């Protein structure tokens with residue numbers, strides 16, 4: 037209630053995309069400093085307290101929810117553009133791993149606060165002006181096997197592994213050749229996302245540990261965040 | 273004389289399901305031939321007259337119709353499946369080895385050769401796309417799923433006027449070359465299906481892939497020219513693709 041903003045401080049503009057229960061739009065937020073800020077517009081007070089560069093920060097509420105502007109949009113669509121000329125230059129492995137470290141750092145933050153991000157995917161990750169990724173939106177091919185049957189932080193670890201696959205493949209859709217209805221039986225028989233072509237075995241061993249049948253056998257986000265930071269260290 | 277294309281039902285043994293057609297499912301089966309030997313086939317589910325016009329086709333880059341049962345379409349079995357899924361797999365180390373450019377062009381040439389054969393008979397393939405292209409046992413591509421009855425494959429003029437000419441097939445083929453050059457990417461990343469007409473109407477087209485040759489992109493770009501009369505025919509495309517392929521090392 038403390039951070040609800042006066043509606044008449046918000047100028048709405050064009051649509052940027054669609055949402056779960058409405059549209060996402062650009063906007064200008066007039067601040068207490070006097071200047072106007074470019075924002076995106078669509079309980080939530082529990083996220084005004086969230087403070088982490090790799091987590092996306094709530095500015096206020098008008099119902100409309102006032103969020104920052106990530107001029108590079110979602111990570112998923114950004115990965116596909118990179119594979120096209122005119123779009124961003126071909127993303128090397130180092131930059132790809134940095135995308136995974138930022139997300140792990142953000143999930144390491146929310147997991148320590150016992151917050152579950154039930155729709156973690158490459159499409160729900162946003163790119164700041166400094167190319168640093170931060171999680172948002174907190175879909176069968178991302179749901180862990182145990183959650184298909186019936187959700188914990190170990191289920192986000194699973195979805196994180198799928199996101200590492202989306203990044204490693206630069207925008208491929210998970211499980212090519214498998215239909216959504218075939219996923220449970222496909223996973224229940226012990227199959228997992230195959231290894232991308234030029235993906236280091238060191239990197240595939242990490243994302244593979246995210247899909248271990250028993251949730252307790254999967255690593256925590258803090259463990260994953262370091263396995264990735266250290267692999268990135270070992271690269272020139 | 274339309275009896276020639278109807279196969280007796282008791283000559284067909286159906287098995288598992290392999291996928292979904294737009295109007296019906298797809299299944300495996302055995303076709304007992306006049307030769308006395310059984311053939312592995314796929315079975316998809318006025319109609320009976322077009323199948324007869326197609327059973328007289330004979331081209332390696334065009335899938336052959338073996339007959340019809342009572343309705344079901346009997347077709348060869350391709351253990352390598354469609355081209356679209358084969359492109360995604362190639363990017364997985366478990367699947368086919370990385371496909372070089374030369375092999376990618378041989379896919380385009382094959383598809384163009386089959387489409388050249390169909391245009392020489394005024395036959396329209398009103399839904400050409402990588403998913404609708406099958407790989408023979410020798411890796412030659414043959415077009416399928418044509419006849420008998422996807423916004424990002426329909427030509428701009430066919431979206432509005434509800435028209436479709438051979439030049440509209442050239443459009444879909446141009447988008448098909450894009451799928452091959454990208455190894456399975458969905459066309460127009462960052463654009464919704466409901467935005468396609470306005471996107472194309474303002475003059476936007478598929479962006480050149482990362483490593484795609486400028487010469488290969490100019491060919492596929494010509495397929496999306498606003499005026500259908502400016503797009504090349506399939507016989508012109510096939511030769512432009514065959515010559516570019518010969519200009520590369522073995």
Ligand SMILES: CN1CCN(Cc2ccc(-c3cnc(Nc4ccc(C#Cc5cc(C6OCCO6)ccn5)cc4)nc3N[C@H]3CC[C@@H](O)CC3)cc2)CC1
Nearest residue numbers: 052053054060076092093094103105106107108109172173
């Ligand atoms: C490369 N190229 C560059 C130019 N691009 C154009 C473009 C257009 C818009 C934006 C953008 C800008 N800002 C935002 N903000 C945003 C962030 C997250 C959500 C969601 C959710 C959510 C967000 C929050 C939150 O509150 C404060 C901070 O975070 C809390 C709980 N849930 C929605 C909007 N989106 C943005 N995009 C959304 C719009 C639709 C959405 O479904 C996916 C991404 C970016 C780029 C195209 C690509």
Ligand SMILES: CN1CCN(Cc2ccc(-c3cnc(Nc4ccc(C#Cc5cc(C6OCCO6)ccn5)cc4)nc3N[C@H]3CC[C@@H](O)CC3)cc2)CC1
Nearest residue numbers: 290291314337348349350351352353354416417418419420
């Ligand atoms: C153990 N068991 C399990 C693992 N299996 C792996 C497997 C399974 C199936 C096939 C396969 C094999 N053959 C085919 N052939 C095929 C060809 C064309 C169509 C279509 C058709 C159609 C054709 C016409 C036409 O008739 C004459 C001219 O035009 C009109 C409308 N529709 C469907 C299947 N697909 C196949 N699959 C396609 C089916 C459509 C799509 O889902 C992609 C894959 C391959 C591998 C196999 C073994």
Ligand SMILES: [Cl-]
Nearest residue numbers: 046047048049
């Ligand atoms: Cl407003």
Ligand SMILES: [Cl-]
Nearest residue numbers: 211212229230
């Ligand atoms: Cl996979």
Ligand SMILES: [Cl-]
Nearest residue numbers: 284285286287
């Ligand atoms: Cl049967």
Ligand SMILES: [Cl-]
Nearest residue numbers: 334335336348
């Ligand atoms: Cl054939």
Ligand SMILES: [Cl-]
Nearest residue numbers: 460461478479
């Ligand atoms: Cl594009």
Ligand SMILES: [Mg+2]
Nearest residue numbers: 055159160173
């Ligand atoms: Mg979303």
